[PDB]
Design a protein around this ligand. Structure first.
Ligand SMILES: [Mg+2]
Ligand SMILES: [Zn+2]
Lengths: 162, 726
DNA sequence: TTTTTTTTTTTT
DNA sequence: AAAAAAAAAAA
RNA sequence: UCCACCAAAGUUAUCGCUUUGGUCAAUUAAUGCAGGUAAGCAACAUCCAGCAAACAGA
DNA sequence: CTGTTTGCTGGATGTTTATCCCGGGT
DNA sequence: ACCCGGGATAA
């Protein structure tokens, strides 16, 4: 189980870091895709991708590195790849999963859950957990709005793996 | 050497430099309007002259030399040396001026300043002359035959004779023989007499018909004689001396309440049509150059407007023998590039031989062409346990056409509907002066709005076609974003949402801002809005944040964006052409995949005629496309190929009763007999059963292809069609 | 050689 | 009912 | 005033029939197909005659 | 049983280029 | 004496 970290900057001012742990042994393909996007090996990555949808008490979302408005996102395998498995459930906060527009439509967009979401089980794949920086996650969430619009531009400046 | 021309299609947005786009739009609009007015004014002059004196020499005026003067009369330019004008030009100009002022008032038209309009006039007048000649050559004989039948009162006499013989209890064949030898033969005698220009035998026609025939024959010169003693042949051989007569023929049709036909070609479409862009036209109108452009610089000028290095303009053909010669055809959206190889400086299977027929063993594909199912294809090796069947239906080809039709139906402004309904009260094909003038005035009354609506792609638009309209974004089940019906983009992260139905006011009031921001960044949306409107739209979007509950901002933004609801009709036509090509290639690929690369195609002999209450069907074009792709295509007759059971050669019948397939007709005729399902009368045809009465059920296309296979096998084994299908 | 005419396909 | 097709009857 | 494609079944080579499993570039986007640097292939405009869709008038 | 606008199908015919001179500028 | 349009004829 590898780990990945992101640096979060609001309006050009760094605000904190979030550390993730990936379920490589459980969801190898999705974890590999996320690691590749985080490391930029394939010539493209989350570097500079904004968080375009933060719903307070519900979720943070991001990963759109081609349009920055939720209409973009591509995976290493191509436009989309099928869902791998559902061995994990949205039973605890801090879970990192993939956003999709339906079955077998996974791309590069991801989201982090701040509260349990039992209604999302069987609809999205969970492949990570936040191990550190959850305080930064709450800090960013406090700037969100119910509609998902952020009070300030929040982007990922740097990303890395450990 | 032999000459070939190949055309390649593209778009203005791709090859045309942005700097020289508006001049092209202005030129296209002006040329289309001038051509339409040229057609209208030519018909007006012809009808005015022919409606006052029948001795007018109308035959000799159907030439490009007169159409050019008619076209130029609609353009204002500095006068030249009048004493150097040609003799015929003076007469043409005088004749045009005799009615120029009246026509301008009738059509409410003013000359449009357009310098260097000679080449455009020549190009458009060549097409006008071609249209006139083609229409006459095509329909003169048929309309003459129709008039001949009407003069003899064929239908009236047939009905009278039939109803008189019915009272006498005559037999069917006796009635038919009486009709043949009392009506048809004298009618044929009249046909021959009119064909050879000689009056028919006395008594075959009444006084009115004799007078009408005299009037028709007075159009031709007294000493003129039809070549080869056939008017139908002389029309094709020497059309020049028939146009006037044609007009008279048309008049006689209107004298008998027959359906009017367009004797004089007219342009009635409001969407701008393609115009020929030449090197001189590009130099004078688009490049705005004011000096002669010789052939040496011919390409260099084209290099300053479009890129010649792209695939569209590159040489093409075997050994790259076809080259672009500075001639295009464009309407402001679609562009056609012509390439030529020379300088511009002025069968049935039953009739095949053994050697050819017997080489197709194991490669024949039997096709049954239908109406709804365009192609039902079966291979020879097809078996009940291995269905090697293919179906190509009308829905696949008509997808795009039906979508565009529904879009136009739903998005048509009420004002355009009212204008079309009002214009519906004036026929155009009529040759009467009153109706033509009425149509001219009616068209002048609605031309502004119709052109503005249909020219929205490039013309200046200020009218608001959608008053009291509110627009709200929607998302479908596939997460695609639509404004009302305009696609925006596919949201790939839309499904993740909180508990169902978050009906809070703030969410539904603020998601509009997010959708608007997503939409405005789209290229195909931003390109349609200028900076003037975009700045105000963004300013209103900014204010929406402060007061989401206010509705005035949404109404104002909807009013501003109402322009997006107009449709790109020309680009829709271009997309239709692309969709047709894609469907053809998809069908070819499916044929090569399902059956084989070297499959031999056997197609039915159905002519697929255009029938009322059914959509047009593609039959000849389908065969031409199939042959162009290298498929050996052979026709097989469909005689008795669907009325017999392949299993036992017994007759078939229709038994199943189904609600009307077309939903709109269900309220009128709720149920009808099934047409595509048949059953075999022979009870023993089906496999053994405990006398349950079950009978084999067949799809008519499947039975047809099986019978085609039977016929092919019989031909292979004996070279003669099976007796049952004689 | 030319014009009706018989039988059949598709579907209403 | 209504459009074209192959082939036969009529002159 | 509507219906994209591929397979199983009611079922029998079963219908503008029906229930399922699989695909989705949506499109008011643009020269299309096929190839991985180029490189090859593809007739277009106008008019007319029929038919189709919306509305109107006998 | 007709009419306007659009479109689908099918048939028929094209798809440029110098040179001369008057009026104007001057 | 020199130059600059722009319609019109024509194969
Ligand atoms: Mg058939
Ligand atoms: Zn049978």
């Amino acid at each position: 189980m590898s780990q990945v970290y992101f640096d979060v900057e609001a309006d050009g001012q760094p605000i904190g870091r979030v550390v993730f742990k990936l379920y490589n042994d459980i969801v190898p393909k999705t974890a590999e895709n996320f690691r590749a996007l985080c490391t930029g090996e394939k010539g493209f990555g989350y570097a500079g991708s904004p968080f375009h949808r933060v719903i307070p008490d519900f979720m943070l979302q991001g990963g759109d590195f081609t349009a920055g408005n939720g209409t973009g996102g591509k995976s290493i395998y191509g436009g989309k790849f099928p869902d791998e498995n559902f061995k994990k459930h949205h039973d605890r906060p801090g879970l990192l999963s993939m956003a999709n527009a339906g079955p077998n439509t996974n791309g590069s967009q991801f989201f982090i859950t701040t509260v349990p979401c039992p209604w999302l089980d069987g609809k999205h794949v969970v492949f990570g957990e936040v191990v550190d920086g959850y305080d930064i996650v709450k800090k960013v969430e406090s700037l969100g709005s119910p509609s998902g619009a952020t009070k300030a531009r929040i982007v990922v400046a740097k990303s890395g793996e450990l | 050497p032999s000459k070939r021309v190949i055309t390649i299609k593209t778009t203005i947005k791709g090859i045309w430099k942005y700097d020289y786009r508006q001049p092209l739009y202005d030129l296209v609009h002006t040329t289309n309007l001038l051509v339409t007015h040229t057609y209208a004014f030519t018909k007006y002059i012809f009808l005015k002259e022919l409606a006052t004196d029948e001795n007018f020499a109308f035959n000799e005026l159907i030439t490009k030399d007169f159409f050019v003067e008619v076209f130029l009369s609609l353009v204002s330019a500095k006068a030249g040396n009048s004493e150097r004008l040609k003799d015929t030009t003076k007469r043409y100009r005088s004749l045009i001026g005799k009615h120029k002022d009246a026509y301008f008032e009738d059509a409410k038209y003013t000359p449009i300043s357009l310098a260097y309009a000679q080449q455009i006039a020549l190009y458009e007048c060549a097409k006008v002359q071609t249209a006139y000649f083609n229409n006459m050559k095509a329909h003169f004989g048929n309309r003459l035959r129709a008039l001949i039948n009407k003069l003899f009162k064929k239908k009236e006499k047939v009905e009278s004779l039939t109803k008189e013989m019915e009272a006498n209890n005559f037999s069917i064949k006796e009635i038919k023989q009486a009709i043949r030898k009392n009506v048809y033969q004298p009618c044929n005698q009249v046909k021959l007499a009119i064909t050879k220009k000689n009056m028919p035998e006395s008594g075959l026609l009444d006084d009115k018909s004799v007078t009408q025939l005299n009037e028709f024959f007075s159009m031709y010169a007294v000493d003129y004689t039809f070549q080869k003693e056939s008017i139908f042949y002389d029309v094709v051989a020497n059309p020049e001396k028939h146009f006037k007569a044609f007009y008279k023929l048309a008049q006689l049709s209107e004298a008998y309440e027959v359906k009017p036909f367009a004797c004089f070609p007219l342009r009635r479409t409001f969407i701008p049509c393609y115009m020929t862009v030449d090197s001189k036209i590009l130099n004078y109108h688009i490049l705005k150059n004011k000096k002669v452009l010789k052939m040496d610089e011919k390409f260099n000028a084209w290099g300053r407007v479009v890129n010649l290095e792209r695939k569209a303009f590159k040489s093409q053909g075997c050994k790259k023998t076809l080259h672009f010669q500075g001639t295009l055809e464009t309407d402001g959206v679609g562009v056609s590039i012509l390439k030529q190889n020379t300088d511009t400086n002025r069968k049935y299977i039953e009739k095949l031989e053994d050697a050819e027929l017997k080489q197709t063993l194991g490669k024949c594909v039997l096709m049954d062409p239908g109406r709804r199912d365009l192609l039902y294809c079966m291979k020879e090796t097809s078996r009940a346990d291995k269905k090697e069947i293919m179906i190509f239906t009308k829905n696949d080809r008509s997808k795009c056409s039906r979508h565009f039709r529904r879009l136009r139906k739903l998005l048509q402004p009420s004002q355009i509907r009212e204008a079309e309904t009002y214009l519906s009260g004036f026929a155009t094909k009529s040759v009467n002066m009153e109706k033509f003038v009425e149509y001219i005035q009616a068209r002048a009354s609605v031309k502004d709005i119709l052109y503005e609506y249909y020219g929205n792609e490039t013309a200046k638009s200020i009218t608001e076609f959608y008053p009291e309209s509110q627009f709200d974004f929607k998302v479908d089940q596939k997460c695609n974003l639509y404004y009302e019906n305009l696609f925006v983009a596919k949201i790939r992260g839309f499904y993740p949402q909180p508990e169902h139905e978050p009906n809070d006011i703030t969410l539904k009031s603020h998601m509009y801002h997010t959708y608007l921001q997503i939409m405005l960044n789209q290229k195909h949306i931003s390109e349609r809005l200028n900076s003037e409107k975009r700045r105000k739209i963004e300013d209103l979007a900014k204010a929406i944040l402060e007061q989401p509950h206010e509705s005035g901002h949404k109404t104002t933004i909807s009013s501003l964006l109402g322009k997006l609801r107009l449709l790109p009709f020309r680009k829709m036509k271009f997309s239709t052409k692309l969709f047709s090509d894609n469907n053809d290639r998809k069908l070819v690929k499916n044929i090569k995949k399902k059956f084989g690369a070297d499959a031999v195609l056997v197609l039915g002999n159905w002519s697929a005629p255009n029938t009322k209450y059914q959509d047009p069907t593609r039959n000849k074009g389908l065969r031409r496309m199939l042959k162009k792709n290298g498929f050996p295509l052979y026709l097989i007759d469909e005689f008795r190929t669907s009325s017999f059971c392949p299993k036992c050669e017994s007759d078939l019948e229709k038994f199943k009763v189904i609600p009307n397939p077309r939903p709109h007709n269900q309220e009128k005729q709720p149920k009808v007999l099934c047409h595509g399902l048949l059953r075999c009368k022979n009870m023993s045809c089906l496999e053994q059963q405990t006398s349950e009465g079950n009978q084999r059920l067949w799809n008519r296309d499947q039975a047809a292809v099986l019978n085609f296979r039977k016929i092919l096998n019989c031909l292979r084994e004996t070279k003669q069609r099976p007796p049952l299908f004689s």
